[PDB]
RNA sequence: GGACCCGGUGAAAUUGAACUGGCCGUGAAGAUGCGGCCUACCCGUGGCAGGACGAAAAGACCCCGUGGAGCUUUACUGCAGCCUGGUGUUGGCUCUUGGUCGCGGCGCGGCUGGGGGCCUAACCCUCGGAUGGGGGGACAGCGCUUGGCGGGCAGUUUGACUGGGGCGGUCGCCUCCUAAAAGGUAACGGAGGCGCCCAAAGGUCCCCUCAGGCGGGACGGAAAUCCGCCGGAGAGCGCAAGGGUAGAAGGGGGCCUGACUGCGAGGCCUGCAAGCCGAGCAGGGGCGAAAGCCGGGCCUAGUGAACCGGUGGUCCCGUGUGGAAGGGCC
RNA sequence: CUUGCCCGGUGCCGGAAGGUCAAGGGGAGGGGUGCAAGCCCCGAACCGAAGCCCCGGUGAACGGCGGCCGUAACUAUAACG
RNA sequence: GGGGGAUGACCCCAGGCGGUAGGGGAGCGUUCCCGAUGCCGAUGAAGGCCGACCCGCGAGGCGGCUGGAGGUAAGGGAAGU
RNA sequence: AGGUGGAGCCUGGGAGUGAGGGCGCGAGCGAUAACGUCCGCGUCCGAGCGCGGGAACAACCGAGACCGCCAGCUAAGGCCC
RNA sequence: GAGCUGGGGCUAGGAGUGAAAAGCUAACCGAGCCCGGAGAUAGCUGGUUCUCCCCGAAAUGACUUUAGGGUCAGCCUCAGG
RNA sequence: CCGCAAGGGGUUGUGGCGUGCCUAUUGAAGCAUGAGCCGGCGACUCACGGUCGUGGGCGAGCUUAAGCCGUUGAGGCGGAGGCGUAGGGAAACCGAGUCCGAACAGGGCGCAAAGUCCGCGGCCGUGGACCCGAAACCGG
RNA sequence: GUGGUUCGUGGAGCCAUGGGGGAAUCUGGGCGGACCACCGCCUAAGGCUAAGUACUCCGGGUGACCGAUAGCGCACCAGU
RNA sequence: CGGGGGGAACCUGGGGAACUGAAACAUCUCAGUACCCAGAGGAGAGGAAAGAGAAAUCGACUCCCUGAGUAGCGGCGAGCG
């Protein structure tokens, strides 16, 4: 009543990682960029990246989401020009 | 969360504006200083506030909500079957 | 002639007027569940749409 | 839980009395007899807390 | 002796229909009927078996229906019978030891338990010549509950996958690769981890600069321990991988426990349920002078519906009212 | 003519002193309502049956009845070890 | 679908129209119950037998021969179609 | 932005199949073997995606079958019989 | 002669009998036959009718004592906004 | 041969293009099965519920069972009930508000848009219920 | 220890009983769902009782009920 | 003096089951049904309450509608109700 070896097969599970609401789009208080749960969100875009450079995403509200290292968490705020007085 | 038989108790759904109106057709009776309990619609008189109390009128009835009590003080009374 | 699974319409159940039906949370909880906080604050009400019909529906009349 | 006499096993801790409760997982492993800190039962708030059970 | 020619009589399964040739090719892959071609007059009777996938029969060998029926045992359960405690119509007489509470003990005391005896009036049997005797006899038959054996029989059951059924494997969940570059996809395709744990890898406040190589000296000649130079961090992080990433998650020390209740705007993935994230609001703390961080961990595995019940809290229900059995809520 | 070897498990036969354990007797004690006498339950220490556990006997009862290394063996188990 | 439809219908062009499970709309005969101020037939009910008018159609009408007695509903209803 | 033109979105009733293959291509397995299977991107067939072609041949090249027998241009493919 | 036999009867079909293969029990008993539960259930098999209009399917994904079923999705269709 | 004449009837000699028909099928002429031929029987129905759509009577809408009236036989009275008239909640109970809670952060709802009875239908449940089909179990 | 009841062992009663104990005659004695107080109901452990509902062999009436393979299978020397 | 034997269907008592549903099947269902038995009648069944329930309210039994597919029973599942 047991379990077998030298038959190493040994399917793999399910992910389901994500930029979603990708670079510049309406931006809404909810799941900024993904690649890391637990995450812990940032303020506005992020253009900080084992890649150089950075990116914003002329969409601003309360803030967005992290991943843990990858994407590159917020805090370049970047509200966009679509912030200002009504 | 049901029980191991049947008991019971009572209580029903009468109402402000509700009465007001389809009482003002009630002045076919004691709608004139208005003594109040139907006799048309529904089972176990009951007073829900909503509406604005009128036709100042003593309800001879079980009870209701709060404001509706209240804007009975509007302009009528308020009387309590049984004993209360 | 009718009834209804009676039972569904005791536990989870139970419609509003608005011709829509709900039933308590029901992440885990009340059974293992050491688990932690937070998670409690996760029992209120929980109302799956679509098949809410077979329900619904299968109950009619009473509820 | 699981209840295996694993260095696993579930306990609670009293609020003073602030009333009941609030969870927990432990192991004997280390300090035994051991298990105390504060929390706040329906009781005001705060208060010492055993956890032993 | 049929078969053949005569006279007489005169069936029968199967068959859509048909004037049905060979070829070499073909089509669903073994064609008279489709293509090209070659022989080719119309019908018959006596025959000879090859093809018409000929006839017989909705394969018995196969697998598939969470079909059926028979036998088997340490399959599941249950009954028949059998053994069995107490109880009954199963009455008397005496011999006895045990418990117990009261007043290791002994005397007594109520209590009550074990048991040994002919009898004996039930009961049964007995008969043997009549209803009386005889034998057994409180048995037992036999009734009720106990418990036990119990395939003797009765009823169900004994999964899926499966590049044929079986044997062999294997089913959950975490990562890589496969996925062709958004997401995401089989394969019994590749390889590898998990059903732990850590009360201190927890919360913060305060400090640290890795592996390694080279050069110089104790106990030291791999391989430390210190001292002086070189360093996109290649060391580091409890566990498998992969991302991360020292600025640090990463290495110490200070007090501290939010490893919070009430909640959560608003999203990720999603047929289901789940799964997962999260500012900010309030009560109440901790860490810092403070600007702030804290609702366990660097993560992604460490898993489970709803019912069937336990228990600590409620004081919501309580089936004439007062309550409690019991129930709902935490 | 001749039926040999094993009762560790199994069925059985015997044992019944000891563990266990049903219904049951039999009381500590708690509980509900009770103005109170009362009035219902839960009840347990101990006594308590076969069975099973444990001791033995059991094979024309079920059933079973070893492995490899060395050695005279000019070569092969073997007489032995 | 859209440009005016008087009830028809007529005109443009857009615009397709192959289709099994299967989804929506419209029609046909079949035997019956109306007889919504309905009745035909001995110079044939009806079925039968045969056909170069009416309809996309499933059917109609209508004319010739047969045969002994029925039943048709201009319109709505029903169903062993 | 939109030349487009005719798909789109929500609510709601009624469904069917819940197992397919064939071809090109990019991968997996496989003797880079099979009219093998296994995932993907487009097509394909669906018992009519019926006709043309490639002799014949669902199926690969062209084609979208409302209907009109004695019209006209071409596709692919052909024009010595 | 556990001999063949006529006539008379006894047993019986979850039960009989059986010099015993599962044999024989009114010509196929691995549990008879008739009436009754009853038109048992039957993811399987067939079978599944008159015309015509309109559009136009899937043969994947997720969970199943589920894999040749079916739930929910995905692709159809009609009513309104 | 022209009882519907300058148009058609019937029969075919040739040639010309042509694989039958049904179920289940990835795919079928079939060599897969279904059927020899003709005529008649023969297969999505009824009931109670519920469910949407529609034809329409009142918006509070609507009727049991029965009492009476009945060539034809003529319906007419019957007001227990039941759906809508708020709902929210396990409940107490409150109530156009309410449950969690001790907090003004969300769930359900308020906001009338109001049905209801009936008729006729596409369906869904109970039904033998689209129609026949077996091996078997159980009673006498 | 079973029954019936909506009650499938349940907090589970009433009535009915298979075995064993075996009360009371009106301040008696069951009952209103474990039990208990108080209230409220009822008076058992014998018997008879037409009418209101069911059923068609029989006779009649009526049919959006059938026409000889339909109707009961059987319209007449058929359960033969 | 009465009985017993009948008798399609219907009546109560006596006894009394699997299929099948639960997509297995042991609980459950079909049901107290189908069948067998006894017996009453033209009708039996039952029938003046140690009843029902709780407004100090109701009163024979029966049957139709309703109560109600409610209160509720349960591998709280199919269902029963």
Redesign the pocket.
């Known amino acids: 009543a047991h379990?077998?070896?030298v038959?190493?097969?040994?399917?793999?599970?399910?992910?389901?990682?994500?930029?979603?609401?990708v670079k510049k789009f309406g931006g809404?208080?909810?799941?900024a960029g993904?690649?890391?749960?637990?995450?812990?969100?940032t303020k506005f875009k992020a253009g900080?990246?084992?890649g150089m450079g950075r990116d914003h995403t002329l969409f601003a509200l309360?803030?967005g989401?992290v991943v843990?290292?990858?994407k590159?968490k917020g805090a370049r705020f970047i509200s966009i020009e679509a912030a200002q007085t009504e | 969360?049901?029980?191991?038989?049947?008991?019971?108790?009572e209580?029903?759904?009468?109402?402000?504006?509700?009465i007001d109106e389809?009482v003002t057709l009630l002045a076919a009776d004691d709608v004139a200083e208005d003594v109040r309990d139907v006799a048309d619609?529904?089972?176990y008189v009951?007073?829900?506030?909503?509406?604005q109390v009128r036709h100042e009128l003593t309800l001879i009835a079980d009870?209701?909500?709060?404001?509706?009590?209240e804007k009975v003080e509007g302009a009528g009374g308020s009387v309590e079957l049984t004993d209360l | 002639?009718?009834?209804?699974?009676?039972?569904?319409?005791?536990?989870?159940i139970?419609?509003?007027?608005?011709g829509?039906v709900?039933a308590?949370?029901?992440?885990?909880?009340?059974?293992?569940?050491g688990?932690?906080?937070?998670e409690?604050?996760?029992?209120?009400?929980?109302?799956?749409?679509?098949?809410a019909?077979?329900a619904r529906?299968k109950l009619?009349?009473?509820? | 839980?699981?209840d295996?006499p694993?260095?696993?096993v579930k306990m609670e801790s009293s609020a003073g009395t602030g009333?009941?409760?609030?969870?927990?997982?432990?192991?004997?492993?280390?300090?035994?007899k051991?298990?105390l800190?504060?929390?706040?039962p329906?009781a005001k708030?705060?208060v010492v807390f055993r956890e032993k059970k």
């Open positions: 379990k077998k070896g038959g190493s097969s040994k399917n793999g599970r399910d992910s389901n990682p994500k930029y979603l609401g809404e208080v909810v799941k993904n690649i890391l749960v637990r995450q812990r969100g900080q990246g084992v309360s803030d989401k843990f290292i990858n590159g | 969360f049901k029980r191991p038989q049947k008991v019971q108790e209580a029903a759904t009468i109402d402000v504006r509700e389809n619609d529904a089972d009951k007073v829900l506030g909503a509406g009870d209701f909500s709060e404001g509706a009590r | 002639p009718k009834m209804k699974t009676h039972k569904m319409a005791k536990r989870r139970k419609i509003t007027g608005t829509k709900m308590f949370k029901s992440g885990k909880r009340h059974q293992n569940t688990k932690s906080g937070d409690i604050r996760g029992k209120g009400k929980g109302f799956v749409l679509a098949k019909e077979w529906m009619m009349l009473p509820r | 839980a699981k295996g694993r260095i696993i009333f009941y409760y609030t969870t927990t997982k432990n192991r004997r492993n280390t300090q035994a051991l298990e800190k504060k929390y706040d329906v708030k705060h």
